[PDB]
Amino acid sequence: VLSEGEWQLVLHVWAKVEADVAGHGQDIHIRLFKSHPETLEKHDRFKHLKTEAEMKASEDLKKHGVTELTALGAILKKKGHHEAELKPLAQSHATKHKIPIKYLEFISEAIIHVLHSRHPGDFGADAQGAMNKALELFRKDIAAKYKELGYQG
Numbered sequence: 001v002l003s004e005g006e007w008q009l010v011l012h013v014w015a016k017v018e019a020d021v022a023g024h025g026q027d028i029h030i031r032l033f034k035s036h037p038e039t040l041e042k043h044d045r046f047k048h049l050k051t052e053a054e055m056k057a058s059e060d061l062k063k064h065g066v067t068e069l070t071a072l073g074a075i076l077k078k079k080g081h082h083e084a085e086l087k088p089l090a091q092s093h094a095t096k097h098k099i100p101i102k103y104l105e106f107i108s109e110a111i112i113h114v115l116h117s118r119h120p121g122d123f124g125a126d127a128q129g130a131m132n133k134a135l136e137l138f139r140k141d142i143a144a145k146y147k148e149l150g151y152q153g
């Protein structure tokens with residue numbers, strides 16, 4: 001459980017992400033795929049894209065990153081009160097996409113890196129700490145939902 005001030009830091013930087021959701025979602029995917037290529041393989045419909053510029057040019061990839069980050073933003077705005085939003089996400093990710101919690105860790109790392117690289121003046125140590133705690137809470141709770149579904153993430 002985060003403090004009110006930690007939530008405010010998370011939502012303040014999130015409002016910066018919302019100025020360009022598509023571009024942040026591209027950058028986070030490209031960082032994730034470069035850092036951890038197995039994660040590209042899980043995105044079965046995007047495995048063909050060869051370079052960063054091919055990734056940025058893909059409308060399908062851009063639209064997917066907006067869907068992904070819109071769901072995360074809706075979860076963060078609930079300030080931990082997110083069972084209703086988490087539930088369907090855990091269902092699809094445990095049963096259809098088969099995303100292990102470790103890959104949620106990898107993308108949390110990519111989110112922190114991209115937020116820091118785009119917004120350093122609004123994402124210092126305290127905001128980083130608050131976003132880390134927010135994403136750790138998301139991962140803990142989605143891992144409990146995975147188990148409810150019979151999936152060990």
Ligand code: ZNH
Binds near residue numbers: 042068069089092093
């Ligand atoms: C932050 C965190 C996160 C979030 C919020 C999300 C969200 C999301 C959403 C909303 C969607 C749509 C719906 C469904 O479910 O299906 C998706 C899809 C999705 N997903 Zn995911 N995710 C994520 C992570 C992820 C990761 C990490 C991975 C890998 C690795 C993934 C993989 C995925 C896939 C593969 C899909 C499908 C895509 C297409 O369309 O193709 N995922 N996703």
Ligand SMILES: [Fe+2]
Binds near residue numbers: 038041
């Ligand atoms: Fe592989």
Ligand SMILES: [Fe+2]
Binds near residue numbers: 029043064065068
């Ligand atoms: Fe994705």
